[model samples]
Target: ANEYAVKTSALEWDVTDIVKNAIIGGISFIPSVGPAISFLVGLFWPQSKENIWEGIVKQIERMIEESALKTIKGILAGDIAYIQERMATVADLLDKHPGSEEARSAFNNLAENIDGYHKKFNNFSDDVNYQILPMFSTTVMMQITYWVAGLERKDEIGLSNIDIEKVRGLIKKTVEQANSYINNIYDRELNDALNNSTADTVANNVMSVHGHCRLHGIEYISIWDRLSEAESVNNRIYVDVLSYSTFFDRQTAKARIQALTPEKDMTPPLKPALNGGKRRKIDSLTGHIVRIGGAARVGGLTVVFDDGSRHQLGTISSETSSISLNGSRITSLEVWGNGAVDQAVFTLRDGRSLSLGSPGTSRYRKFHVGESHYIAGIYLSSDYSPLAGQAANIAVSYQLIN
Candidate 1:
C-alpha cells in the first residue's frame, strides 16, 4: 500500500519523517528514529486516519488510565498492597509535554520526571519482577518529545505551529494502539496473528515485530539517526521468557518471536489483476460528465463507467429504461432524442455495443473520442441543483491513455 508515501523512485524515500527535523521554539529537534515512520510512509494513509484517529485519539488518556489501573492490578490482584504506589506514579506524567514557556516546562517536567518515574517503576517491577508496563506510553512520550525537539525550524519546513490537538491526536492514536497491543498480549498470548480468524484482523506482523522492538525501548529510526551508516539488521533480537515467568513476560516473549509480514498481508492476492483495479491516472472519474435526461422528464437515465460505478439522472418513473455499458473505455456514444432520450448507443473498447430507449432519428448528441483516448466517467444532470431532479442533459469527461 503506497498510500502515504509519495514515491519518487524505486524503493527510495526520504522516509525520515518530515514531521521531525524541523525546529520550533522550546521544542528541540531531538533526533530519533521510529521504524514505523518508514512503515507508515508506505502503508498508513491519512485518509484511514480520518476514520480511525478521531475514534481512538479522543480516548487515549482514559484508555491508558484504565489500562494502567488494570495492568497495575494485574501485576498483583491477589496482593493489593503492590498496586497503589505504582499506579500513582504511572498515571500522572501520561496526563502531562514541550512547546512555549508552558509547553517547554510541560515537556521538560515530563521528560525529566519521567526518567526518575521509570526508575521508581523499575524498582517496583524489579523487586516485584513479575511484569513491566510494556512501556508504550513512555515510548510515545519520548517519541513525541523527540519529534517536538527540533521545532525551531518549523516554519522553515512549513510544519504549521504545533497544535496541542494534533499533538494529543498523534499521541492518543499511537498510545491507544500500542496499549491495546500490550493489553491483549498481556491478557492473552500472541498467536500467528492478532484476533485470529476475526474480521478485525490486521497485517499484525507488520505492526507486531515493530512493536516488539518498542518493548525493548529501541526505535530503529533512532539507530539510523545516531548512525547514518546503519543499514540492515546485523543482529537478532532474542526474547527469552521462563515458562513460569510473569504474565507480561511470558506473553511478550511469545510476541517478540512473531511472524514475517508478506504472506500475512490482509489483502488477498491477484485482486488488482482480477479486477479492473489499475485505474487510468487521467481518468474522467476525477472530474465527471454531467447530463440531464430529455425534457420529457418521465424516465430516469443512468451512465455506467468502466469500473462498474455509475450515476443516474432525471426522476425515475414507470417509463425509466436501463442503460448499461461494458466496464471498458467508451470509445463512441450516440444519444438519440428529439428532446428526451429516444435511442442511445454505447460502444466500448472491448467490442461491446449496447443501446437504450426507443430508436429516434434526431440524435440529441454524439460523442466521439479518438482511438487513443476514451471516456471513462459520466454524470447526468436535470434542471435542478446538486444531483438535479433527474439527468436531463449529458456531457463527456474524456480521459487520456492509462
Candidate 2:
C-alpha cells in the first residue's frame, strides 16, 4: 500500500485528470476506454514532448516487431475470439475514423486470409504461415495516445526533434514506473478480485479495456523485461532459432526457447477470469497468505495462487524458489538445518516436490500437514542478508487449523 502510493507520488502525473481528457477529447486512434483502461490508454501518460510523439509511429512499429506483433501472433495462433472481437473493434474504429478508405483496403487484404475456421475451429492454425494485420491495432492506439498526450501537455513541446532512442527510453522509463505501480497492485488485486468478488471487479475493470482486450500485470512486466535491454529485432525467425535476443533473452536465446520470449500474450481470457476460475469463498476467507513487504528491494520467495496471482514472502538470496498451489495442497514439508535453515523442501499433493537453498550439514526433517493443508509462509530471521549478504535462521510457517 505504502509503496504503491509512494510510486504514484513520485511520478509527475495526476492520472485521473489526464484520463478524463482522454475520454472527453476522444480520437479514432483508440476506440474507447474503461475504468482501469487508463493504464493502457495512458500509454504515453502525462509526460511528453513533440519529438517523442512525432517518432511514436516508428516506436510502435518497433514495438510491433519486438513485442506487440509477436504477442498478437502468439494469440492468433491460439485463440479465435481474439480475431473476431479485434476485427469487430477495428472495423468499428475504421468506419468512424478519418483514414477509413485506404485503411479499409489495407486491412481487407489481411482479413481475407482469415477464414471461417477462425470462427468454426475457434483458432487460426493456418495463420502460422501467413502475415497478419500487425500494424493496424498498435498504430491506431499509438497515434491516438499521441494526440491525448498533446492535449495533456497542451502542445508546450510542439514539433521538437528527439532521437528515436531517447523517445524509446522515455517510454521504457514511463512503463517501468507504471509497471512498478501496477506490479504491486497486480499480484494482490488479481488474487483479491478473484477470491473476494469471483473476479467480478477484475472482469469488469480488466476486460472493459473497451477494446475487448485484457491487461495482465505479470505479462506486461514480462514484455518490459524482455525488451528491457536489447536493440529491437524480430523475434519470429530467430524465434524458431537463436538469432535476435535481449537482456532477459540472452541466455535463453542460446538454447531454443519454448516460444517467442514471454509468449503468454498477456491476453487473459476474453471470457476468462470472469466466467470461470472462481475460487471458493471458504478459500477466499482462509487461503490468503500476506505477501512479505519490500520483495523487490530484498528478493523473496513467491507463493503463487490458483488464479495465476502470486504472494510474496521470506527474503531471498542467491537462491529463490516459487510455489504454485492451484487446488494442489502442500502435503508435506522437509527442512534441513542445524542452528540456521540451510535448505527447505515441499511435497505438493500434485506429485511435485521442490527444494530451495543449500542442503544443511546436519540433516533433513520432514513434517506432514493434514489433508486440508496450505502454506502459511516462511520466515528467515535476522534478515540482514539483503544488506550485509549473510545467512540467517530460516523456518517454515504453516497451520493445521485455519
Candidate 3:
C-alpha cells in the first residue's frame, strides 16, 4: 500500500544510471568496439571514484529477534511451545530495559499486545480460531526494530528530529503492512465463507472466522446464506478446515520469508503488498461489550482491581483522554497508573472474563466494566502515552438476545 511507503522519492537515486555504465562496460568486452566502449563507460564513471569516505548507511535494519519469529510460527500453528518461548523473550526485553523508559515502554506495550490476542484467540476450549492482530502486532514489534536501526545518530540521550521522523516512517509502514495483510486475508476467508452453502454451515464458519479476522483490523464475513446448493454437513467442515489452514499457511509463510529478507530502506515493510486490497467497511460489531460505568477515580492513580492486581501511577507519565483497549474504548481518562490499571478486569456476557490494561498505566478511565463502577483520582500518564495510540478502535459490543 502507498501508505506503507514513506515519501522519499526525492531521496531515491536512479538505478538506471548505474545500469547504463554497467552496460557500456559489457560492450567494451566486444572485440572490435571494445576499447572505445570501455572508454565511454569510464568517462561516465565518477572521475573521483577512487576517493572514498568512511560513513555508515543511515537506514536502519530493524532487528526481529528469533523468539518473535518463533512465537509467530507458534501462534499460526496453534503451538504453545513457540508461543511460550516468545513470551520469555518479551519478558526479557522488559526486564533488561527497565532502566530506559523508552525501551521499557516499548517492551511492555509489545507484551500486553501479544498477551491480549493470545487470550482472545484461545478463549474457547475447542474452538481456537485465527487471530491476526497479535500475529501482526508481533510482526510490527519486530518490524519496528529495523526501523529503529535507521536512526543514524542516537546519543545516550533521546532521539533527534530526524531520528523521530525515521521512527515515525517505519511505524507507519508497519501499520500499513498490518492493514493490507488483514484486509487481504479477511477478503479471502470471507469470500470463501460466503461461497459455502447451508445456513448452519455458513453460520459456523462465520462465527469461527469473524472474531479472528476483526481482531486483526479487517472486516468479517457478514453476508452468509447467499448460496443455494448448501454443502452437506461433513463436507462443510472438511472444506472449512482445509481452506482456513491453507490460508493460514500462506499468510505465515509470507511473514516468515519477509522477516528473513533484509530491509535496506528507511521504512521496513515486513509484509509489503504488491497492491492494496479494497478495505472493507469497519465492523461495528467487533468490540461489543457491556458498559461498566460513566466514570471513576484513581487516588494517586495507584489502585487494585477487584481481581487482586495492584498498580502504581508513577510509572506512567501521561494518559490519553480517550484510548482503545481490546478493541474497545476506556474514555474519560483522568488518571494513569502502573499496577492497578495494568489489568483492569471485565466479564463478558458469556460468563467468560476478559482483562483490559497493560504493564504501563491503563489509559481508559471512564470504562464500563460489567456492573461495576471504577474510578481513579490521579492521572499518572497523558493522552500522548504510546499506549494511548493504536491502529484499531473498533470493538464487538456484546449483547444477549435473551
Models 1 onward score TM values of 0.24, 0.23, 0.26
Better of 1 and 3 by TM-score: 3
Off by over 4 Å in 2: 1-299, 306-310, 316-323, 370-376, 381-391, 395-402
TM-score of 1: 0.24
TM-score of 2: 0.23
Best-fitting candidate, scored by lDDT: 1
Query: Global lDDT for candidate 1?
Result: 0.32
Measured on C-alpha atoms, candidate 3 has an lDDT of 0.28
* Model 1 per-residue lDDT tens digits across residues 1-402: 211211011110112122212111111122222222222222212323321112222322233335544554443333222222222222222223112344333333333332322222233432121133323323333344333332222332233445333433443444444444444433332342344423222222223322332322232233223221221122122211100100110112212222222212312110011133233211122112223444233234454434444444435445443434324566766665543344456677778665555543454556553453354433333443443442334433333232
Report lDDT per candidate: 0.32, 0.31, 0.28
Q: Per the 3 Å backbone cut-off, how many clashing residue pairs does candidate 1 have? A: 33
Candidate 2 yields a Cα-based lDDT of: 0.31
Q: By how many angstroms RMSD does model 3 differ from the true structure?
A: 26.2
Tens-digit per-residue lDDT, 1-402, candidate 3: 111111111111111123222321232132221132223223222344420000000111122234443444444445433433444444344345433555434533442343333233323322112222333333332333223322221232134565455455545544555555556655655555545524323432432344344322331111011011121101111011001101110112222222223212201111111123311111111111111132222211233322233433323323322112232322222213332233334333324343433324344333221221111111122222332321111111111010
Give one digit per residue, the lDDT tens place, for model 2 in 1-402.
211111011101111222222333333353322211233323333334222122223323332334444555444345433433444444444445424444333233323333222122112232211112112222223323332332232222221234233444444554455445444443443344333432213222221111111111222233334333332211211100001101110111111121121223321111112224232111110111122232211223454434544433334454444544555655566655443345556677678776655553555455442343233333233243333322233323222211
